Write a structure and sequence with these properties.
part of a larger assembly, 6 chains, A mainly alpha, B alpha+beta, C mainly alpha, D alpha+beta, E mainly alpha, A: mainly alpha, elongated, B: alpha+beta, five-stranded antiparallel β-sheet, 1 helix, 7 strands, about 15% helix, about 30% strand, flat, RNA-binding, ribonucleoprotein (chain B), structural constituent of ribosome (chain B)
RNA sequence: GGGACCGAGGACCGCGCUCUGCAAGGAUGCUGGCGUAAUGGUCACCAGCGACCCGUCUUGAAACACGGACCAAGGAGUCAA
RNA sequence: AGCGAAUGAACUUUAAAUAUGUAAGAAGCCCUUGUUACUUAACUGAACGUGGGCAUUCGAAUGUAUCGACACUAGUGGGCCAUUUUUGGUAAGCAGAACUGGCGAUGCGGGAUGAACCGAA
């Protein structure tokens, strides 16, 4: 009878996508990056970046 | 050169012979032979007016006509697919028998060793 | 799921009666076997899976 | 030409059987965004070599940020521009903070004095002048004078444009 | 529910894989060239006069 | 995602039917393996073998005019300060305004 | 969080969910004044903005040219072979 | 572009820009064999077919708000302007050809104004 937007209506989004509840509860839009010591930029890369 | 009624010919219009030469619109054309005479060949060509195509009949001599190979790609494919299909059924795996358009290139890495990049100015001074 | 992806099968009434109809569709998706209108080649996808099983592409034991 | 950024664009001709591991050329391009920097790369490479977008690919595009965007520098820009007569040479100096800001200052300057367009200006060299004696133009020379200090005569105050009527007349001293 | 579970995981893994490959090329000295895009959205913005 | 969820309509017997149910996706693209919205979104984004059937099933998207306008003059190419042509990821800024 | 415009259908059925029912196949609940020119409508006039005088003929088109003082009644593709 | 390939627009390994002709399978086939007054030294070839299969991507993409044939009926059968390509000439004008677009049957926004401009039906 009328088209209801799933971006604005939470009930329509759960009708079309039942994982939208688990997406919000587990905060899958806010996943942190994996751990690890980030290794430095190699010196050859910086010299080419500032070559001229 | 021997021509048969019904084959596909290409009109080139050589400038050595001024007899039997068609118009410049019919130069560099391609049509189907409907009539063969002693020295001239009648070729049916297509010409577009606004949206449709009006078929026109022109008499072109032997010195301006040559065979084409546009069909030859189609018959080359019809045997190549035939042998491939028989060879596929012989050992029993499917093969993509179609030709597909060129796809975007996949990801790859390029090493910088031995190929250090050269910097270039907008205009060359040397 | 780790080999040919296969997003999970709709089970339908009963178990295995219609699930492996959907499995042949999903395998033909990942292989790329369709129709003129796009209808997947379920039978060629099935003979692909059997051939891959004969070659040892899928692990399994009793 | 907007808030320009320096880009390091590296591109090469497509690898073939006759010539695998191709030449790998590199340019520095001042462009408003990523997409313009690729286009200026292939435009400049087309004039120099026979490498176009159809037979070439982009290897890397990186942004060259300033080392010290808080230190005042004297820059020298050597450029060619095209007029109705032909192609000419200039060397102009700009007292700025970043290499991109000197290029923005150059484009507005060439549009103002000489009515030059972005399509006619070729930037050949942007050089930071390390020493004070390297400055050659008198408008930069008076800026690098020892104990430089000046007043600001006739300063019109910032009055809001919706304040149509004022009660007392403004002053232009402070 | 399980189809949408594996789609979200795949999108995250595909995004991280492009970053990791670009990182491991930069530290090995090389350049990683990402794949040319397979999808394009075309919007018509001009009238059909002339 | 926003285009399919908000402006997504289907060709069902030559008619423009909004995608308000997962059922009408299954009646039309269920033989291709597509049974819900997320499979339709997965197929367009990760370009699969059934892209031709899924893209043709979608009615062409009737976007509105962008919020904030195009540019001062929009009939030049994007690489000379216009709007026509190819833009890498700036089409996402255009799609956000037209949605 | 702050606004604007709209309430389309008329027992139930469907797709779903935050569950003694819900925001889920289109607005209900509570309250006030008036119950008559109050809303609404029709003319006359002022105000803001818009707006060549009709028909015929020619031509790619205009322009020229022709008819037009006003009203009532009559007035032009019919019949036969 | 090269002539650290040969040779010398009329040179080429390669190859633009810009439009353009033709072909892309079920009507094609392939395998077995029937006719012919065509053809061949000849159960040799050419045409039409019978029997099996390629019917699930059946042999590029994209679209498809259907397409073809026969019979019948009405209005039409003038051009103007512009882009691009091309031919000829003049002191300068200008004259011809091909494609395409606009106007003729088209209202609306803009260019103060409006047959030929921009935007958009």
């Amino acid at each position: 009878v009328q088209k209801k937007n799933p971006l604005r209506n939470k009930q329509i989004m759960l009708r079309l996508n039942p994982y939208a509840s688990t997406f919000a509860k587990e905060k899958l839009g806010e996943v942190k990056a994996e751990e690890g010591k980030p290794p430095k930029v190699p010196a050859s890369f910086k010299e080419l970046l500032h070559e001229a | 050169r021997t021509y048969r009624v019904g084959d596909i010919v290409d009109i080139k219009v050589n400038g050595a012979v001024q007899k039997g030469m068609p118009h410049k619109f019919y130069h560099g054309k391609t049509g189907v032979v409907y009539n063969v005479t002693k020295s001239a060949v009648g070729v049916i060509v297509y010409k577009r007016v606004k949206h449709r195509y009006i078929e026109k009949r022109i008499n072109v001599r032997i010195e301006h006509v040559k065979p084409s190979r546009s069909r030859e790609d189609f018959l080359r494919r019809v045997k190549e697919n035939a042998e491939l299909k028989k060879k596929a059924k012989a050992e029993g795996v499917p093969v993509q028998l179609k030709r597909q358009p060129a796809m975007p290139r996949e990801a790859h890495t390029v090493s910088i060793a031995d190929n250090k990049p050269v910097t270039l100015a907008p205009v060359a001074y040397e | 799921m780790q080999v040919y992806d296969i997003p999970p099968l709709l089970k339908d009434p009963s178990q295995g009666g219609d699930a492996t109809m959907d499995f042949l569709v999903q395998v033909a998706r990942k292989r790329g076997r369709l129709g003129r209108g796009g209808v997947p080649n379920i039978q060629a996808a099935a003979m692909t899976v059997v051939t891959d099983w004969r070659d040892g592409r899928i692990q399994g034991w009793t | 030409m907007g808030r320009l950024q320096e880009y390091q664009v590296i591109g090469r001709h497509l690898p073939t059987e006759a010539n695998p591991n191709p030449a790998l050329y590199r340019m520095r391009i001042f462009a408003p965004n990523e997409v313009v920097a690729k286009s200026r790369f292939w435009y400049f490479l087309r004039g120099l070599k026979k490498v176009k977008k159809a037979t070439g690919e982009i290897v890397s595009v990186n942004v060259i940020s300033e080392k010290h965007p808080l230190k005042v520098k004297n820059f020298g820009i050597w450029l060619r521009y095209d007029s109705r007569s032909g192609t000419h040479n200039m060397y102009k100096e700009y007292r700025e903070t970043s290499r991109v800001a000197a290029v923005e200052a150059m484009y507005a300057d060439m549009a103002a004095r000489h009515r030059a367009r972005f399509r006619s200006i070729h930037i050949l060299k942007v050089v930071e002048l390390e020493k004070t004696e390297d400055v050659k133009r008198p408008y930069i020379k008076q800026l690098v004078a020892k104990n430089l200090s000046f007043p600001l005569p006739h300063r019109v105050p910032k009055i809001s444009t919706k304040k149509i009527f004022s009660a007392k007349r403004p002053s232009t001293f402070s | 529910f399980k189809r949408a579970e594996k789609y979200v995981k795949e999108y995250r893994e595909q995004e991280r894989e492009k970053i990791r490959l670009a990182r491991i090329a930069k530290q090995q000295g090389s350049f990683h060239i990402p794949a040319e895009a397979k999808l394009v959205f075309v919007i018509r913005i001009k009238g059909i006069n002339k | 995602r926003e285009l399919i969820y908000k402006r997504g309509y289907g060709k069902v017997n030559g008619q423009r039917i909004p995608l308000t149910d997962n059922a009408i996706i299954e009646e039309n693209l269920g033989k291709y393996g597509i049974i819900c919205i997320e499979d339709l979104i997965h197929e367009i984004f990760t370009v699969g073998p059934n892209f031709k059937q899924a893209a043709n099933f979608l009615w062409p998207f009737k976007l509105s005019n962008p919020n904030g306008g195009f540019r001062p003059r929009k009939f030049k190419h994007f690489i000379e300060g216009g709007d026509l042509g190819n833009r890498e990821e700036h089409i996402n800024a255009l799609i956000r305004a037209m949605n």
